[PDB]
Amino acid sequence: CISVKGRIYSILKQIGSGGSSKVFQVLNEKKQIYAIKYVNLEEADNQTLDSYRNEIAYLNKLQQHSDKIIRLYDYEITDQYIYMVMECGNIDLNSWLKKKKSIDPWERKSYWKNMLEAVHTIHQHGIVHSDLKPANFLIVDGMLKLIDFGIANGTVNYMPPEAIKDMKISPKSDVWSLGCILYYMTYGKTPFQQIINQISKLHAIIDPNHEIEFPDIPEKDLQDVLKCCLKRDPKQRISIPELLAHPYVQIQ
Ligand SMILES: COc1cc(S(C)(=O)=O)ccc1Nc1nc2ccc(-c3ccc(NC(=O)[C@H](C)c4ccc(F)cc4)cc3)cn2n1
Numbered sequence: 001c002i003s004v005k006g007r008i009y010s011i012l013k014q015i016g017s018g019g020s021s022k023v024f025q026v027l028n029e030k031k032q033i034y035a036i037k038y039v040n041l042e043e044a045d046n047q048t049l050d051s052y053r054n055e056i057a058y059l060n061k062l063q064q065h066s067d068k069i070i071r072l073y074d075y076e077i078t079d080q081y082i083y084m085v086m087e088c089g090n091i092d093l094n095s096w097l098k099k100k101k102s103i104d105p106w107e108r109k110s111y112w113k114n115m116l117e118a119v120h121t122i123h124q125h126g127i128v129h130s131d132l133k134p135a136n137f138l139i140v141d142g143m144l145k146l147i148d149f150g151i152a153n154g155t156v157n158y159m160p161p162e163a164i165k166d167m168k169i170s171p172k173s174d175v176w177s178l179g180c181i182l183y184y185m186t187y188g189k190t191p192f193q194q195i196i197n198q199i200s201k202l203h204a205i206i207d208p209n210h211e212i213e214f215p216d217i218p219e220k221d222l223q224d225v226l227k228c229c230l231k232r233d234p235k236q237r238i239s240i241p242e243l244l245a246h247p248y249v250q251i252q
């Protein structure tokens, strides 16, 4: 059992395991299920501490706004630890993408509508996630949900081109990454999943004369979204507001 704000939660099991953190499935007093995230601050430098405070502040704040942000029922913070008590998932996306070989199309689209609402609402509060990946979303009553904001602190397929020339972050960056996910969700893999040598996989992402391949398919709209989501020049890439009005999410 765990105590947050003098409330007892019988642990049912581990679900998540970071270096300094855990996620637990958990029964409350009335034996309703919840996920609780534990973070251990014992070893946490001052920025890492501010990053946590910020992510939490912003996750706290976007409760009102969107059911597509992971619900957060309560939290405690202390110099030693953090507990966050949250609605409990079925499974993350990275998980659910690996097993599924064949995806119903009215359900891929429902999930895409869900990703757009979520990322739309963080863009409206000046949050660019800057590292979107399926890990960052969670299925919850068949509804897809964002669980973090890329503020707090090993795949590389979802990385947008402009990211690689950091070496300035516009919400377009997120659109690329949502792209990369949607691509996997229709062509069973990410765009640069074939190019295993990483030094060159980076070179492919930035190269305009390199051509991402979009197999012709039944939903032409969906083919259009992916091409528009994966334009290298971010000012030519399609905005979240644009994507929300695209036939693909609009035509029934
Ligand atoms: C059976 O349940 C399952 C099973 C399987 S599995 C093993 O089948 O793949 C998989 C999943 C579930 N459920 C589940 N439910 C929930 C609810 C909430 C979250 C959740 C919410 C927010 C965060 N936030 C953060 O990690 C960020 C980085 C953060 C936030 C605050 C900080 F101070 C520091 C960092 C992270 C996780 C995760 N899960 N996961």
Ligand SMILES: [Cl-]
Pocket (backbone or CB within 6 Å): 028, 073, 074, 085
């Ligand atoms: Cl509660």
